[PDB]
Amino acid sequence: PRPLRLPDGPPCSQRSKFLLMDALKLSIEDGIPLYDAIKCMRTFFGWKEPNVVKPHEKGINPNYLLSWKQVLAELQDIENEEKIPRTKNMKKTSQLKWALGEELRSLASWIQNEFNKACELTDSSWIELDEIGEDAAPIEHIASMRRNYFTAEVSHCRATEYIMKGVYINTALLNASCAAMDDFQLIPMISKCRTKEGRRKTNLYGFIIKGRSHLRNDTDVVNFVSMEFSLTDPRLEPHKWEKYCVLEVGDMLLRSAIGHVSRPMFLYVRTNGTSKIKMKWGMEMRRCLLQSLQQIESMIEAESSVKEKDMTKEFFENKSPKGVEEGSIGKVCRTLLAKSVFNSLYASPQLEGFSAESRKLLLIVQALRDNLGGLYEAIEECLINDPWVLLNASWFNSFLTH
Ligand SMILES: Nc1nnc(Cc2ccc(Cl)cc2)o1
Numbered sequence: 001p002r003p004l005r006l007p008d009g010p011p012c013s014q015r016s017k018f019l020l021m022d023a024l025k026l027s028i029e030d031g032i033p034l035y036d037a038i039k040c041m042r043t044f045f046g047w048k049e050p051n052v053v054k055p056h057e058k059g060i061n062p063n064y065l066l067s068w069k070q071v072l073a074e075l076q077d078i079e080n081e082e083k084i085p086r087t088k089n090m091k092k093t094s095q096l097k098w099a100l101g102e103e104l105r106s107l108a109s110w111i112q113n114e115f116n117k118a119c120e121l122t123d124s125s126w127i128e129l130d131e132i133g134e135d136a137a138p139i140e141h142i143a144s145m146r147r148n149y150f151t152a153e154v155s156h157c158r159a160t161e162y163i164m165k166g167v168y169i170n171t172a173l174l175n176a177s178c179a180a181m182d183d184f185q186l187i188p189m190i191s192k193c194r195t196k197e198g199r200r201k202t203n204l205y206g207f208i209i210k211g212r213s214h215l216r217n218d219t220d221v222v223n224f225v226s227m228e229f230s231l232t233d234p235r236l237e238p239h240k241w242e243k244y245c246v247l248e249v250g251d252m253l254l255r256s257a258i259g260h261v262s263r264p265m266f267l268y269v270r271t272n273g274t275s276k277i278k279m280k281w282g283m284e285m286r287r288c289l290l291q292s293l294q295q296i297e298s299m300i301e302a303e304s305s306v307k308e309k310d311m312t313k314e315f316f317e318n319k320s321p322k323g324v325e326e327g328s329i330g331k332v333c334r335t336l337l338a339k340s341v342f343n344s345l346y347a348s349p350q351l352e353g354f355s356a357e358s359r360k361l362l363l364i365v366q367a368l369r370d371n372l373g374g375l376y377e378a379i380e381e382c383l384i385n386d387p388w389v390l391l392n393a394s395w396f397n398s399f400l401t402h
């Protein structure tokens with residue numbers, strides 16, 4: 001029947017907790033986070049006097065600039081102290097006190113592009129061979145072969161970077177929120193990976209500064225300010241960046257398909273917040289690897305029940321089905337993962353309603369198609385402004401044209 005009526009209005013904007021496809025890393029080829037951050041910072045020499053290039057319409061833009069200058073200034077202090085401290089509590093300046101707090105939207109093309117990027121392979125690997133699972137006992141042979149096949153396909157996947165990025169920053173923020181309750185602690189955004197050649201590498205995405213965090217319960221909120229490197233010029237797609245003040249903070253010399261080029265380096269700045277319970281879920285994002293592995297195993301066990309033999313080799317080596325719609329078994333694994341990871345990155349009540357209610361309508365349209373009102377309101381009451389939900393609604397309407 002009817003396609004879901006998606007809402008008209010200004011394009012939807014980014015609302016993840018940290019940048020996704022736009023992130024930029026300052027890296028070192030190799031664990032106290034602040035020390036890692038500083039060594040990453042000193043690898044870059046194209047810093048310059050920072051200025052606003054895309055203002056935050058609803059924010060106090062001078063304060064965001066003062067805040068970044070303060071970060072560089074207090075890191076400059078840390079460098080002079082003979083012993084680099086374990087943590088750095090920021091001076092409680094007026095700009096930080098302000099920053100720390102002491103409507104229908106249409107679907108924009110950028111969220112589909114984010115998703116596509118999350119399915120891509122990266123040069124580096126983001127997990128260990130035995131990252132997936134938490135068994136007490138040794139795992140049996142068929143389970144081990146399935147985990148090693150699936151692990152080979154998603155260890156280099158971009159969405160796995162997003163998982164480990166997310167795990168690190170939520171663990172550091174949750175820890176700081178009870179170890180340094182009254183401090184405006186400077187918290188590096190770090191990840192770790194292993195290069196194509198097997199070299200261990202440490203990545204700095206930027207920094208967050210947390211506010212006062214007396215989190216008596218799970219829904220209590222701690223505010224923070226994120227400051228994230230990027231090469232994305234925000235002026236190309238300003239609607240994506242409604243929540244940010246974007247600074248130009250340097251220039252970077254790059255290898256490119258035309259040889260060496262200098263590109264501006266930007267800093268995406270926004271205020272944000274999270275709660276205890278959201279930080280605990282952030283710490284469990286590696287579950288996305290486990291849950292999507294199980295969706296794969298649910299498929300192999302279905303095929304194996306038909307063919308009265310184990311079909312793990314035949315499934316993963318793509319050796320009954322004569323192809324793979326997404327292209328390869330590897331792409332299916334990475335699409336499942338990326339969906340699971342984006343469910344985590346863009347979790348919301350709107351996503352919850354859309355999933356459970358659109359599920360009911362799918363079975364009804366499938367049973368109708370095979371053999372041949374109130375659900376629509378429940379579904380469309382969830383189509384408000386969340387980019388991930390709007391995309392999934394758009395995907396659902398494709399399934400409704402075939
Ligand atoms: N740790 C650290 N703090 N600042 C820097 C580098 C720098 C150099 C020049 C300018 Cl204009 C700004 C920052 O490194």
Ligand SMILES: [Cl-]
Nearest residue numbers: 133286287290
């Ligand atoms: Cl796990």
